[PDB]
Design a protein around this ligand. Structure first.
Ligand SMILES: *[C@@H](C)[C@H]1/C(=C/c2[nH]c(/C=C3N=C(/C=C4\NC(=O)C(CC)=C4C)C(C)=C\3CCC(=O)O)c(CCC(=O)O)c2C)NC(=O)[C@@H]1C
Ligand SMILES: *[C@@H](C)[C@H]1/C(=C/c2[nH]c(/C=C3N=C(/C=C4\NC(=O)C(CC)=C4C)C(C)=C\3CCC(=O)O)c(CCC(=O)O)c2C)NC(=O)[C@@H]1C
Ligand SMILES: *[C@@H](C)[C@H]1/C(=C/c2[nH]c(/C=C3N=C(/C=C4\NC(=O)C(CC)=C4C)C(C)=C\3CCC(=O)O)c(CCC(=O)O)c2C)NC(=O)[C@@H]1C
Ligand SMILES: *[C@H](C)[C@H]1/C(=C/c2[nH]c(/C=C3N=C(/C=C4\NC(=O)C(CC)=C4C)C(C)=C\3CCC(=O)O)c(CCC(=O)O)c2C)NC(=O)[C@@H]1C
Ligand SMILES: *[C@H](C)[C@H]1/C(=C/c2[nH]c(/C=C3N=C(/C=C4\NC(=O)C(CC)=C4C)C(C)=C\3CCC(=O)O)c(CCC(=O)O)c2C)NC(=O)[C@@H]1C
Ligand SMILES: *[C@H](C)[C@H]1/C(=C/c2[nH]c(/C=C3N=C(/C=C4\NC(=O)C(CC)=C4C)C(C)=C\3CCC(=O)O)c(CCC(=O)O)c2C)NC(=O)[C@@H]1C
Ligand SMILES: *[C@H](C)[C@H]1/C(=C/c2[nH]c(/C=C3N=C(/C=C4\NC(=O)C(CC)=C4C)C(C)=C\3CCC(=O)O)c(CCC(=O)O)c2C)NC(=O)[C@@H]1C
Ligand SMILES: *[C@H](C)[C@H]1/C(=C/c2[nH]c(/C=C3N=C(/C=C4\NC(=O)C(CC)=C4C)C(C)=C\3CCC(=O)O)c(CCC(=O)O)c2C)NC(=O)[C@@H]1C
Ligand SMILES: *[C@H](C)[C@H]1/C(=C/c2[nH]c(/C=C3N=C(/C=C4\NC(=O)C(CC)=C4C)C(C)=C\3CCC(=O)O)c(CCC(=O)O)c2C)NC(=O)[C@@H]1C
Lengths: 172, 162, 162, 172, 162, 172
């Protein structure tokens, strides 16, 4: 996989070049913004169980056909698998946040996922809704101004939203 | 590619768990050390040409037979001299990438892997490159932790050739 | 799905051999026991609503805090009370399927697998369901071997929750 | 896999229903007819070697191109593989008889078999003939009125014929 | 198919290395022995019909019950007698192929594999074929190393049936 | 796999025939020409390292885009893989020479190789050039009149050239 730094290095190597004054400045800024990134990962991770459970409850309340006998989330084994998927997706999204790049999310999670759901008969459009719910909850938690040094994390939240939407699009 | 961040993620992923404080502290260590690493990276890049030119001559001086012996694997011809300078530039570039990434990953992937096979096949002596790396270490002009950073990756390359 | 017949076939198939008398006797045992099993299944089905209604109240009585505590995982709201009755009905339905199949397969597949994960995630106490199952066992009205059959699967569910 | 009983259960669960008075009666009848089913399985199984050998001999007598040098059943290794297939098919058919459902036969035997023979170059039309031969012999043995309590097993024989034809169609 | 050459290549290939003198000497051994092997192969082929006819009668003489007993697996009918002669011809043909290839490969692949399964399924006695092979060995008319070659493969077949 | 002898045997078996007077004569000739075949294999094998290195150097001198940063042979790991492939191809070609048949080369090396290079992004046309270079060097070494009993090896060299061209066509 790659993180934001390795990504720039890989691009420079393909061209056989040393980094430019600008590239150095860009990477240095990422470092200066590191604290905020660490807070977002810690905050989301620390509330992972509630983010998944709350999103799952909301999904089934909105879409009761999923839990109705015959539905794809009916039976404990399917419900467990569904809950697991939510947790897995959230897990990989947080990895992307820490890395500052979506490579790990794309390679280890999203790639081939749509084809997996199609083969199983799982409604990807419904998974997308679940992802969107976790997205809104994850950002509200990460960007909560309480109990943290005051500052602007808007760019980071936009980046985080991007990963969630990316995952949602990969299944929807 | 091996960096403190990808390494943190790999650990959590192999265990199928979310990142914990154990991993986050590692990344913070990396973010804090970046200051010194970037200082080293910028300096080596800024001074790349003189370091490369000087390193090549250091090799020719230590191993004079590399400038006169017949054979494409020596620097006895314009072409050989160009290949040599190119190679030394590759090493220096890799060192700067490692400093930027905060790990050995770049050098491990683009250079060390297959290194033994290449030197054996093309009859290139590892001793030549070690001398060039020693020159860069002795003359990069860095001090303090920026020097510690630069030297760690230069010595890493030297050990890979030993 | 685990039944005495699929289990007989699975054994022969794993050994790559035709069914033998060893397996056929097992199926006969299953066919003979079916009489009692079906009697139990029909009774529980015929009396399903009263057993479910009674079982739910038995839980509320043993655990009164389940009817007043705030939270979606309790029965303190019309919705919660509906979810509870639904769940108990699921258990009773599974018990009848096991009796019909002559094995634990149905309950194993549609209910027990993932059971721990579900109760932990939605904050449902296993103790609630054990009480409901104890009520069904005490009040199904069966005697003789039909009772033995019903109780074997009810206790199987109780052990899966313990 | 599923047997006749599990099949009804699976259908009821998908609908979230208890069994109806009729369904109970149907399954109870199957049980009452259990003895006949056990006799058919025992009788066919007890003559498995002759059923396969006799059918194989007949097939090669009818179709000598199969054993002619170059034929698909030429060489001991191919003849052995051919004999094995016959035995395998008969084995799975008997499993279906015991279960009262063709699921095990379809899942573990017939699925992908046509594609297997096509890749190998084995003539499925000839395998179908072999299956039909075992079918006629298996039923004659299972429905032999000698040495057994007198009764009507016509429905069961029709069911057994169905499994054989099912296997024959899956390769032909 | 097993020959001294494919065996040499298989060894080098499993070790992921080029052929060495170790393997080349093996092939030379095979090329030198070919002289005797081919002499044997040509003779058995030239005299194939008489050897087959004689071998079949040798079996009928040793086992008279093979010419009169009722059953398709005996030679008591034109068809059975044709199947028998065919089979013996298959063995002789395989022996010539082994001599031509310089190895057991042909017989291993077209005949020995599945041999036990075939004889058991069709009620063919291995003793019948051993007698036929003994006849061919006693009457092939070869001497010297050509005989050694022919007999090695005939005895190989006999051992496969024992 | 098969060698020249097993090949004739396989063809005869498919027809259920003993070998003909001609077939025996053909195989006997191959044997009589065995020495030359052994010399070609020994000579090529004994110079395998230089044949590959010289061909590789020539290829990169002709096609410098391959080693330019970004090129498919850039980085030590790709250069090593490239060198390995050359050696692998040469290895299998020599096996074909010893066997007197291309089966081992086709089955264990060339089959699926074009698809492998396409998936990786390796330019097969360039690999073909590398193969052709080794071909010319291998034949010059094998057919060197110095240090060997004088004789005509033209047929054999034509056979050897055939295997190389076969490998070149399988990637080009
Ligand atoms: C947006 C996400 C919210 C926000 C963030 C914000 N955080 C900081 C500063 C710090 N964050 C940390 C946290 C860590 N450091 C670590 O090494 C680890 C891993 C164990 C963690 C979790 C630290 C140490 C700091 C600096 C000291 C401090 O507490 O201030 C800032 C300030 C940026 C600047 O730190 O550098 C900001 C803006 N602030 C918000 O209002 C959002 C809700
Ligand atoms: C059709 C297939 C033929 C036929 C069958 C037929 N069988 C029975 C009755 C019995 N069969 C058994 C056999 C078993 N019981 C077992 O537990 C096992 C496994 C070890 C076997 C093999 C038994 C015990 C009976 C009952 C006692 C008896 O011998 O009668 C019937 C009678 C149905 C009724 O048994 O219930 C019938 C009709 N009859 C035929 O004519 C067909 C050729
Ligand atoms: C063409 C390829 C060149 C050529 C070949 C040529 N070689 C021989 C004869 C011999 N070659 C060997 C070599 C071996 N024998 C072995 O068992 C092994 C494996 C360890 C090897 C490598 C031998 C023993 C001979 C025979 C004795 C001798 O040295 O002459 C011939 C003569 C053919 C005839 O041998 O039979 C020829 C023509 N000659 C050339 O000019 C080409 C450059
Ligand atoms: C939940 C919101 C929805 C839902 C989910 C559901 N998923 C499955 C089954 C699988 N999901 C995956 C996905 C992954 N596996 C991985 O290892 C990774 C990366 C770490 C991913 C993304 C896989 C492989 C499966 C199948 C294997 C398995 O189940 O173990 C199911 C099960 C379906 C079934 O058993 O038939 C379900 C129900 N279902 C819904 O209705 C929601 C919309
Ligand atoms: C310089 C210290 C001495 C010297 C060098 C020399 N090198 C080569 C050829 C090669 N060098 C490499 C090295 C790399 N390729 C890579 O992709 C990487 C990582 C990014 C490295 C380090 C390779 C692969 C080659 C061969 C292929 C090529 O030409 O690029 C030569 C030429 C050898 C030849 O025979 O053509 C020379 C001369 N030689 C000296 O005498 C100096 C002391
Ligand atoms: C009743 C004894 C007590 C009670 C129950 C209660 N249960 C839920 C929610 C769920 N129950 C299940 C159970 C199953 N699903 C299955 O597919 C199967 C096998 C067929 C079983 C046994 C599941 C999966 C859920 C969650 C998903 C859903 O809503 O269906 C709730 C609601 C919890 C919530 O937060 O929304 C309640 C209240 N609660 C009590 O207090 C009773 C004592
Ligand atoms: C016989 C009547 C005909 C015939 C058969 C024949 N079959 C094969 C090879 C294979 N058959 C299978 C089928 C199965 N394998 C299984 O495990 C199962 C389920 C338990 C089935 C249905 C497979 C997998 C093979 C290939 C693997 C193998 O042979 O081990 C052959 C062999 C062909 C060959 O070796 O080239 C033959 C000859 N051939 C006929 O002519 C008859 C019409
Ligand atoms: C002769 C020594 C005695 C004899 C022979 C006999 N054999 C058969 C039938 C078969 N023989 C084979 C043998 C092979 N098939 C092969 O592909 C190969 C390798 C190339 C061999 C060795 C096989 C497969 C059969 C059965 C299928 C077929 O008919 O070809 C029979 C007929 C048996 C029957 O019941 O139809 C006979 C009579 N029988 C004797 O009494 C002789 C002493
Ligand atoms: C060299 C002249 C050119 C070149 C080659 C190149 N090849 C690869 C990678 C692979 N090659 C193979 C081929 C084989 N593997 C086998 O086991 C066999 C039979 C024994 C063959 C023929 C395979 C499987 C690979 C991929 C697996 C691997 O690399 O280990 C590469 C690597 C590409 C990459 O890492 O992305 C390269 C560079 N490249 C050139 O530019 C030359 C024209």
């Amino acid at each position: 996989m790659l993180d934001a730094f390795a990504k720039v290095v890989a691009q420079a190597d393909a061209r056989g070049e040393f980094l430019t004054n600008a590239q150095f400045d860009a990477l240095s800024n990422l470092v200066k913004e590191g604290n905020k990134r660490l807070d977002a990962v810690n905050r989301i991770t620390s509330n992972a169980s509630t983010i998944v459970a709350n999103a799952a409850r909301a999904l089934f309340a909105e879409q009761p056909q999923l839990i109705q006998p015959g539905g794809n989330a009916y039976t404990n084994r399917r419900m467990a698998a569904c809950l697991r998927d939510m947790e897995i997706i959230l897990r990989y999204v947080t990895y992307a946040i820490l890395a500052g790049d979506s490579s790990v999310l794309d390679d280890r999670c999203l790639n081939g996922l749509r084809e997996t759901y199609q083969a199983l008969g799982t409604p990807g459009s419904s998974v997308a809704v679940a992802i969107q719910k976790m997205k809104d909850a994850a950002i509200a938690i990460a960007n909560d101004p309480n109990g943290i040094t005051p500052g602007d994390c808007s760019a980071l939240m936009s980046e985080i939203a991007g990963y969630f939407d990316r995952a949602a699009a990969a299944v929807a | 590619m091996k960096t403190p961040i990808t390494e943190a993620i790999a650990a959590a992923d192999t265990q199928g768990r979310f990142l914990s404080n154990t991993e986050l502290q590692a990344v913070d260590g990396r973010f804090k050390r970046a200051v010194a690493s970037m200082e080293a990276a910028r300096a080596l890049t800024n001074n790349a040409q003189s370091l490369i030119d000087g390193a090549a001559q250091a090799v020719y001086q230590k191993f004079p037979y590399t400038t006169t012996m017949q054979g494409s694997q020596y620097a006895s011809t314009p072409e050989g001299k160009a290949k040599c300078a190119r190679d030394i530039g590759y090493y220096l570039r890799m060192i700067t990438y490692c400093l930027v990434a905060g790990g050995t990953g770049p050098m491990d992937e683009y250079l060390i892997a297959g290194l033994s096979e290449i030197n054996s096949t093309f009859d290139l002596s590892p001793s030549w490159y070690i001398e060039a790396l020693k020159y860069i270490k002795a003359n990069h002009g860095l001090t303090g932790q920026a020097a510690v950073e630069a030297n760690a990756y230069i010595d890493y390359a030297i050990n890979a050739l030993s």
